């Protein structure tokens, strides 16, 4: 699988090791909700992490489903 991950600087399109083929994308706005926008977490997952009231998650099964909102898959 080819996921987008925020575990690198800069963001990279790296393939997930065996066991995780769900490209997720968490989002939520912290104390900098305005000047910057919602946080952006991306990467690999074996199962779609949980969701809280303030978060905004989207997990997939394809390659590169989770690009930064200012990019395209």
């Amino acid at each position: 699988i080819v996921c987008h991950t925020t575990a690198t600087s800069p963001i990279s399109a790296v393939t997930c090791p065996p066991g995780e083929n769900l490209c997720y994308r968490k989002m939520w706005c912290d104390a900098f909700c305005s000047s910057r926008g919602k946080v952006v977490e991306l990467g690999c997952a074996a199962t779609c992490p949980s969701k809280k009231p303030y978060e905004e998650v989207t997990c997939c099964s394809t390659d590169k489903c989770n690009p930064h909102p200012k990019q395209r898959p």
């Binding site: 912290d30 305005s34 000047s35």
Partner: protein
Amino acid sequence: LTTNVWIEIQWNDYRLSWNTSEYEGIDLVRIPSELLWLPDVVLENNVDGQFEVAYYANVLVYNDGSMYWLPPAIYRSTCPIAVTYFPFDWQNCSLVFRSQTYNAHEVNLQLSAEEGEAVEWIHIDPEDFTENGEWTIRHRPAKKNYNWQLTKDDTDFQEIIFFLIIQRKPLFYIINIIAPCVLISSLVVLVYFLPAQAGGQKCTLSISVLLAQTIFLFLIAQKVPETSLNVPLIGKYLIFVMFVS
């Protein structure tokens, strides 16, 4: 009320505009606030004399003259207490922000518009916010208020107020003051099953419970505010159980 807040001031200075093509595309510059004009936005409802912010951070200056100042502050506000139901009380504590220099004919204080909707509330990071320990935040509104006893001048006409309606966690008091005093004052009904004769020790028990209630009164007096508008609830109950004893 003591708070640590990051207040985000935003305004426009036509003097700090530039054309990016003349400066290799630079659209954003940081300039220390000690070098720039700032609106003297202060906390008026302060108990100490700290009207201003704590860290004078730099001001992000954009090519169009937009200024983003995110200075953090530590403010000791004043909010009167409502003792009536203490310690089962909720307090309505306000932070009043206005300019102590400029008036409404000069500056127009307003709230932020994110996505075209006004931010009429205190922002609180739901993940990286630690609840206090004794006070829980229920409401956190923010409104623009005007003192109509004054004019569009006078520098106190307009003010942005942020409210913090906070409900107390009355647990220390429960398991350190309330429950002990209750269990101890419930003992004065046991004098009714003791014999009315030398050795029964009715008055012993009763007057010793009164003594314990006196000690609890001394302990509470170290915890209640010194206001004289209403009688709190725990002191009221202490008086009640002392009258009963």
